[PDB]
């Protein structure tokens, strides 16, 4: 499944930060849309693991669903 | 009591808010964030190690500017 999250990013540095923590987690295929403040992820990790990883950044995060 | 200074690569207000949230979550800290100068000052008993690790959770590039 491809999980979609709303992540409050407001500059390229914000997106870069999200990319860095997801890479640290590893085993992820993702794309970040800055203007629409959305991050889509595909991985063997649980939704909870992904959510916690994103929330640890200090940014506002919410789960939108999956495709 | 110790007063630490860190360099944090923040590039927008949202970046600063995220740093604030991770420090608020850690607790036991008195901090000041200087966005334009990419500097975060922290007065805390928490070890330099703990503070560095906490700031790194933001996914931003962090370095130590000393006591
Ligand atoms: O610290 C490595 C970590 O940084 C990220 C954050 O987006 O990527 C940036 O740094 C890379 C250098 O290794 C650049 O190639 C890349 O373009 C840049 O965004 C993570 O992707 C990477 O794991
Ligand atoms: Cu930002």
Curated annotation (Swiss-Prot), chain B:
Belongs to the ATX1 family. The modification N6-acetyllysine is found at residue 60. GO terms for biological process: copper ion export; copper ion transport; intracellular copper ion homeostasis; negative regulation of apoptotic process; response to oxidative stress. Cu cation binds at residues 12, 15. Keywords: Acetylation, Chaperone, Copper, Copper transport, Ion transport, Metal-binding, Phosphoprotein, Transport. The keyword Ion transport applies. Changing residue 21 to E: Has no overall effect on Cu(+)-bridged heterodimer formation with ATP7A. GO terms for cellular component: cytosol. PANTHER family: COPPER TRANSPORT PROTEIN ATOX1. InterPro entries: Copper_transport_ATOX1-like (IPR051881), Heavy-metal-associated_CS (IPR017969), HMA_dom (IPR006121), HMA_dom_sf (IPR036163). It comes from the Eukaryota. It comes from Homo sapiens. Homodimer. Interacts with ATP7B. Interacts with ATP7A. Interacts (via dimer form) with SLC31A1 (via C-terminal domain); this interaction improves ATOX1 stability and controls intracellular Cu(I) levels. Binds and deliver cytosolic copper to the copper ATPase proteins. May be important in cellular antioxidant defense. Ubiquitous. The modification Phosphoserine is found at residue 47. GO terms for molecular function: ATPase binding; copper chaperone activity; copper ion binding; copper-dependent protein binding; cuprous ion binding; metallochaperone activity. The heavy-metal-associated domain (HMA) coordinates a Cu(+) ion via the cysteine residues within the CXXC motif. The transfer of Cu(+) ion from ATOX1 to ATP7A involves the formation of a three-coordinate Cu(+)-bridged heterodimer where the metal is shared between the two metal binding sites of ATOX1 and ATP7A. The Cu(+) ion appears to switch between two coordination modes, forming two links with one protein and one with the other. Cisplatin, a chemotherapeutic drug, can bind the CXXC motif and hinder the release of Cu(+) ion. This is Copper transport protein ATOX1. Residues 1-63 form the HMA domain. SUPFAM superfamilies: HMA, heavy metal-associated domain.
